[PDB]
Amino acid sequence: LRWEKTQSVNVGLDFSVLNQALNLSVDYYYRKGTDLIGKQMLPLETGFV
C-alpha cells in the first residue's frame, strides 16, 4: 500500500505589456494519475475475489 501517483506536466506563458497595462498568464497542463486506489477484481490465485 502506497500513495497514488500523479505524473504531471505544465507549460506556461507569462506576458506583460505597456507598464502592466495588460498582463496575460496561460498554463496548459496534463496530469496522468496512476496507482489510484480502488476495488479490483483480482485473480483467484490470491486468497480473495
Binding site: 477484481m41 483480482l42 485473480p43 483467484l44 490465485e45 490470491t46 486468497g47 480473495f48 475475489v49
Partner: protein, 423 residues
C-alpha cells in the same frame, strides 16, 4: 511532533499474538476443500443417484464430461485452496512478528503453516496436474504455486517438478519446526510430528520414490502402529476421528451432499471377499441393484487426512516395489489380520505368500482400494499406478475412459480461468 510509524488501527481484529495467529490458522483449517471426494467421483468406487437434482450436479463429473459439462455441475473449489494457502503464507511470513508466545508455540505454528501449504499444493497438483510417474509430465505446467501473500501479482502455472520440489521443501521446513507429538482429540485436525512423516510417505509414494516412502512409513510406524481390530469390534470405522488409527483428522473427504448423492456400485463391492468386516462396517444393506450407501463419511466426525491404515499399505507398496517381498508380505497381512475373519485370513495369508512381486503389488493395490474406500484414495491411486481403462454404464449409455487418458487430470475450474486467463 510524532513518533515512530508504528500505529495499529483500533476498529477490527489485527492478529499479532500467537493466540490470534492460531485463530487465523484454525479458520484456514476449517476451509480445507473437500475436493478429494469429488475427484474420487470420477473413479469406480462411487455411483450417483438415478434421480434428478443430483445428476445435474455430479453426473458430468462421474462420466468425465470435461469438454461440455452441465451448467449447474458441481465445481472444484479453486478459490478455497488459494484462500487457505494465503492464510498459510501469511502465518509463514509473520514469524518474527508473532508476540506473546513461547518459541516452541510459534515454531509449531509456522511448521503447521508450512505443512498445510505443502499438503494443499500436493492435493492441488494431484487434482489439476499430470501424475508425477507419467512419462513427459515432469515438465508440464500444472498449477501456480502460492508462496507469498502478494495481491498485485498474477501467478503462472508451474511444472509438476517445481510443484513437487516446493512440496518436499515445505515438508522439510515443517519437520524442523513442528514440535507437538500429540494433539487433543477435539483439536486433532492440527498437524502433529507424525503428520510430517505421513505426508512425506504419501508424497514419495505419489512421486515413485519408494525408498523414502518406506523410510517415512517405517518412521511413523515405529511410534503409532496400533490398528482398529474390527474382528473384535465389527462396527468401528478407522475413518472416525476418535479412532486410535487417526493421525490428522483434518479433511472431511465426503461432504454431506456428495455422500448423500452417491451409491457404491456392485462392481466395486465385488472386490471384497466373503469374510470381510469392511464389507459390513463401511456400507449399508444392499438395494434392488446391490448398491449400498456409505456410512464412512458425509458428516464431520468422519474426518481423516492421515492414519495408520494408509501407512501400512504405503510401506507394503514401497517394499514390494524394490524387491523386498518379505517386508511387503510382513507389512501386508498385518492389515488383513485386523480386517478379515480368522477363517478367511489364513487363505489370504497363503495367497499372499504364493505371489511374486507383480501379483503382490496388484494385491496391495486391491487392498488399498478396499481399505481406503470412500476416503479420497481411489482416483489418485488410479492415476499413480497404471491409469487403467475404465468402462462405466450409466442411464443406458456407456462411457469409456481409455488408458493413459488426458481426462485423468481434472481441468482447472472455469472460475479460475475466468479470473486468470493465462491458466
Amino acid at each position: 511532533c510524532d513518533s515512530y510509524l508504528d500505529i495499529r488501527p483500533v476498529g477490527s481484529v489485527i492478529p499479532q499474538t500467537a493466540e490470534e495467529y492460531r485463530a487465523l490458522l484454525a479458520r484456514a483449517y476449517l476451509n480445507v476443500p473437500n475436493d478429494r471426494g469429488l475427484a474420487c467421483l470420477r473413479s469406480d468406487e462411487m455411483l450417483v443417484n438415478d434421480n434428478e437434482y443430483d445428476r445435474n450436479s455430479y453426473g458430468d463429473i462421474e462420466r468425465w464430461n470435461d469438454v461440455s459439462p452441465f451448467p449447474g455441475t458441481s465445481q472444484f473449489t479453486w478459490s478455497n485452496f488459494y484462500n487457505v494457502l494465503f492464510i498459510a503464507n501469511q502465518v509463514i511470513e509473520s514469524q518474527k512478528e508473532i508476540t506473546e508466545g513461547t518459541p516452541e508455540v510459534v515454531n509449531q505454528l509456522v511448521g503447521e503453516a508450512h505443512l498445510l501449504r505443502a499438503y494443499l499444493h500436493f492435493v492441488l497438483v494431484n487434482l489439476h496436474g499430470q501424475p508425477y510417474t507419467k512419462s513427459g509430465a515432469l515438465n508440464s505446467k500444472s498449477i501456480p504455486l502460492k508462496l507469498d501473500t502478494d495481491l498485485e501479482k498474477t501467478l503462472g502455472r508451474n511444472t509438476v517438478e517445481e510443484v513437487y520440489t516446493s512440496i518436499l521443501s515445505d515438508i522439510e521446513h515443517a519437520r524442523e519446526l513442528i514440535n507437538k507429538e500429540k494433539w487433543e482429540t477435539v483439536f486433532s485436525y492440527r498437524f502433529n510430528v507424525l503428520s510430517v512423516d505421513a505426508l512425506q510417505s504419501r508424497v514419495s509414494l505419489y512421486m515413485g520414490a519408494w525408498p523414502k516412502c518406506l523410510e517415512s512409513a517405517e518412521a511413523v510406524l515405529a511410534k503409532k502402529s496400533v490398528l482398529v481390530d474390527m474382528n473384535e469390534t465389527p462396527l468401528a470405522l478407522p475413518n472416525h476421528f476418535e479412532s486410535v488409527e487417526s493421525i490428522t483428522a483434518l479433511e472431511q473427504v465426503m461432504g454431506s451432499s456428495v455422500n448423500n448423492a452417491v451409491w457404491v456400485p456392485a462392481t466395486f463391492l465385488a472386490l471384497y471377499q466373503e469374510g470381510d468386516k469392511r464389507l459390513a462396517a463401511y456400507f449399508a444393506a444392499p438395494d434392488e441393484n446391490g448398491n449400498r450407501k456409505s456410512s464412512k463419511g458425509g458428516k464431520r466426525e468422519f474426518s481423516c487426512t492421515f492414519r495408520v491404515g494408509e501407512l501400512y499399505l504405503n510401506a507394503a507398496e514401497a517394499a514390494a516395489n524394490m524387491d523386498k517381498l518379505p517386508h511387503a508380505r510382513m507389512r501386508l497381512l498385518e492389515l488383513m489380520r485386523k480386517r478379515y475373519t480368522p477363517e478367511a485370513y489364513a487363505k489370504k495369508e497363503n495367497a499372499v505368500n504364493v505371489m511374486d512381486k507383480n501379483a503382490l503389488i496388484s494385491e496391495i493395490l486391491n487392498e488399498r482400494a478396499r481399505e481406503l474406500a470412500f476416503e479420497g484414495h481411489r482416483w489418485f491411486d488410479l492415476r499413480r499406478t497404471t491409469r487403467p481403462r475404465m468402462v462405466k454404464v450409466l442411464q443406458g449409455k456407456t462411457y469409456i475412459l481409455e488408458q493413459d487418458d488426458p481426462r485423468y487430470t481434472i481441468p482447472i475450474p472455469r472460475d479460475a480461468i475466468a479470473a486468470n486467463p493465462g491458466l
